[PDB]
């Protein structure tokens, strides 16, 4: 199908005023004549609600921020549903709601919605009553899970509140006959739930489904005579507000006040009454919030002699590898981790980027020269000549292992532990490799080796969030 109508119409949006509107039953629990304060998603009073029109084709895909309030004048059944979804395309499930005249159909399929989804309407002359509806909503709809059928949801103003909470799609509706001229009325009316579909999909955008007649037909246009009746629908957005819902004796919400709307309503809420006596009341507290953080720490000191091992003018042989202790310094692992000069860099336990935050008691550097074919031996629970007659790693926690090919510098002076010499010929697995193992001592003593601590500029005369040397 999929005839597109949105040729060029690009008028700027118009806002009417949702006076006191879209107050539903935010609860399934009966109340006597009590002034109950509820905190939930609501449409704030006297808010600017956008005003779209049946004519001008007005079916833009709109954002489903937290849940919307949908109102509609429509003396004739011209609004036929909504296509809530995320992408409104394939590869993402979308929700479709449509009612014909005597039945409402709800589907959550992998729809292939059109750019201008709507429903054609036709009246056959033998019986002028069947409004023979044609679907121009989607081209493909397959592989879906939810399908619910009931009596239809629908100057006969109709109001809806859709909200997507924790896998549930909740619909609250209220249909009222209205006499006012064009816009939303003023009388308070409380929406009450229709259904709670366990749809469980993500909804971020939505679009209403129109019913268009075909007034005329040019031979090839498909977009010739789609007259759009005469109606109007308004789309408001639910915001988390606190209300004070006056329940009746019977449990009907006869009135409400919007706490965050203005100081008077806030007072009515905090006093839990619709009438406030003359006086002064305390409602809340003002607090200036911080605008930025300032973190700041001691001033950079001695660096760990990461200045001595990987350099070594000569490395010791693996039969008599060296074990140097390093302590009481700041260990910048970022430089070595960013360095591309290392052929291999395997760390166990902690990612190499978090070592700046972590602290240790001591660190030991096991430095020796091996071959690339023997690099696999530096691992817990490994066997082989090196692991069995030479440096052997424990089965337990290991630190970090660093290796790199050293052909240029080290290619019979190097022996391996009955002792044999490497055939290092300066001409890949037989080239020399230098290996340094970082073993961490994390319990032996109070911590003295730690990463540095990035400082930030200081800002004065503003409420700020600070951290002075741990205070």
């Amino acid at each position: 199908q999929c005839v597109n109508l949105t040729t060029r119409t690009q008028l700027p949006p118009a806002y009417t005023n949702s006076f006191t509107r879209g107050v539903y039953y935010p609860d399934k629990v009966f109340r006597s004549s009590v002034l109950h304060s509820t905190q939930d998603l609501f449409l704030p009073f006297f808010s600017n609600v956008t005003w779209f029109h049946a004519k001008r084709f007005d079916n833009p895909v709109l954002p489903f921020n937290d849940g919307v309030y949908f109102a509609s004048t429509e003396k004739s059944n011209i609004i036929r549903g909504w296509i809530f979804g995320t992408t409104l395309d394939s590869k993402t499930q979308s929700l479709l709601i449509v009612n014909n005249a005597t039945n409402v159909v709800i589907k959550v399929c992998e729809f292939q919605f059109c750019n201008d989804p709507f429903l054609g309407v036709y009246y056959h002359k033998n019986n002028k009553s069947w409004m023979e509806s044609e679907f121009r909503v989607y081209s493909s709809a397959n592989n879906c899970t939810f399908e619910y059928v009931s009596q239809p949801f629908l100057k006969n103003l109709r109001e809806f509140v859709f909200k997507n909470i924790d896998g549930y799609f909740k619909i609250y509706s209220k249909h009222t006959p209205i006499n006012l001229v064009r816009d939303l009325p003023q009388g308070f009316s409380a929406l009450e739930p229709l259904v709670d579909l366990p749809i469980g999909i993500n909804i971020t955008r939505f679009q209403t489904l129109l019913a268009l007649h075909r007034s005329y037909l040019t031979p090839g246009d498909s977009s010739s005579g789609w007259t759009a009746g005469a109606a109007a629908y308004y789309v408001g957005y639910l915001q988390p507000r606190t209300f004070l819902l006056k329940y009746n004796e019977n449990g009907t919400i006869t009135d409400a006040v919007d706490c965050a709307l203005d100081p008077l309503s806030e007072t009515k809420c905090t006093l839990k009454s619709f009438t406030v006596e003359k006086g002064i009341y305390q409602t809340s507290n003002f607090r200036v919030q911080p605008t930025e953080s300032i973190v700041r720490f001691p001033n950079i000191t001695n660096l760990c002699p990461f200045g001595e091992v990987f350099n070594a003018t000569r490395f010791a042989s693996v039969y008599a590898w060296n074990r140097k202790r390093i302590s009481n310094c700041v260990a910048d692992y970022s430089v070595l981790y960013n360095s591309a000069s290392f052929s291999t860099f395997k760390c166990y336990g902690v990612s190499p980027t978090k070592l700046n935050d972590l602290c240790f008691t001591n660190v030991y550097a096991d430095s020796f020269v091996i071959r690339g074919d023997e690099v696999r031996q530096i691992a817990p629970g490994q066997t082989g000549k090196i692991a069995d007659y030479n440096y052997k790693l424990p089965d337990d926690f290991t630190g970090c292992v660093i290796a790199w090919n050293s052909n240029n510098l080290d290619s019979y002076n190097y022996l391996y532990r009955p002792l044999q010499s490497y055939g290092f010929q300066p001409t890949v697995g037989y080239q020399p490799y230098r290996v340094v193992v970082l073993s961490f001592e994390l319990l032996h003593a109070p911590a003295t080796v730690c990463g540095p601590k990035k400082s930030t500029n200081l800002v004065k005369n503003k409420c700020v969030n600070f951290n002075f040397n741990g205070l």
Epitope: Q1, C2, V3, G120, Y122, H124, K125, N126, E132, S133, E134, F135, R136, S139, S140, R214, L217, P219, G220, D221, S222, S223
Partner: antibody, heavy 124, light 105 residues
Framework: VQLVESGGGLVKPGGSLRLSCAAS????????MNWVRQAPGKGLEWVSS????????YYADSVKGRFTISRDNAKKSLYLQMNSLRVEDTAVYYC??????????????????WGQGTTVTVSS | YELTQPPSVSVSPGQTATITCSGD??????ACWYQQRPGQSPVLVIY???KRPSGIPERFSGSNSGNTATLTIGGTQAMDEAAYFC?????????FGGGTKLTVL
């Protein structure tokens, strides 16, 4: 839209063929298509129909179980199977746009965009 | 289902043409009306028994009720000489008429 038919040619009875019908602009999808023949000296007489989604397929009685109409909106063209030929399958074949979407709306429109037909001759 | 049309109708240019379509209980069905001149693909002239697509001149007048559906060309001219086909749908079977035959004298 503008439609062009192709694939019609001489074949002996009992053979096979595949008619073609390509569209002009992507408004192809919004059109239910229909095939109709012209016997070389006779009137319009309907062949079969297929909807915009391709989910109704309805053939004429004289042609049931021979023909399989298929539609691909992505390649934006209409196809008709030939099978097990009559001799009086010989005709010029028209591919025709309804504009309705489903079963229930084909009666409300005329068959209104029409490619220049392709002639199929079925002779021994 | 059947559509019965007179084999031929002859009207002098400038006159009024009239063309029917008979068959069973017809007026409970939308009947389309079809031009096709010799050697050409046809063209619509009526649908839904009273509608005229855009570009269709106002002379191409017709309506349906009862057991016959009619086509009227007021102010006939030399352009008009063509074959005209009645059409209808029967339980989703497109049904074409025999086809009346213009002769613009």
């Amino acid at each position: 839209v503008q439609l062009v038919e192709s694939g019609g040619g001489l074949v002996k009875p009992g053979g096979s063929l595949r008619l073609s019908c390509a569209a002009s602009e992507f408004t192809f999808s919004s059109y239910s298509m229909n095939w109709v023949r012209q016997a070389p000296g006779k009137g319009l007489e309907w062949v079969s129909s297929i909807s915009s989604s391709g989910s109704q397929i309805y053939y004429a009685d004289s042609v049931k179980g021979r023909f399989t109409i298929s539609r691909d909106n992505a390649k934006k063209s209409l196809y008709l199977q030939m099978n097990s030929l009559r001799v009086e399958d010989t005709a010029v074949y028209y591919c025709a746009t309804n504009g309705g979407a489903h079963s229930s709306t084909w009666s409300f429109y005329g068959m209104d965009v029409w490619g220049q037909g392709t002639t199929v001759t079925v002779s021994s | 289902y059947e559509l019965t049309q007179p084999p031929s109708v002859s009207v002098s240019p400038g006159q009024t043409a009239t063309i029917t379509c008979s068959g069973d209980k017809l007026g409970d069905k939308y009947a389309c009306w079809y031009q096709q001149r010799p050697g050409q693909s046809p063209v619509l002239v009526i649908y839904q028994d009273s509608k005229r697509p855009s570009g269709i001149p106002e002379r191409f007048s017709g309506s349906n009720s009862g057991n016959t559906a009619t086509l009227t060309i007021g102010g006939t001219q030399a352009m008009d000489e063509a074959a005209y086909f009645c059409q209808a749908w029967d339980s989703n079977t497109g049904v074409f008429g025999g086809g009346t035959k213009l002769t613009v004298l």
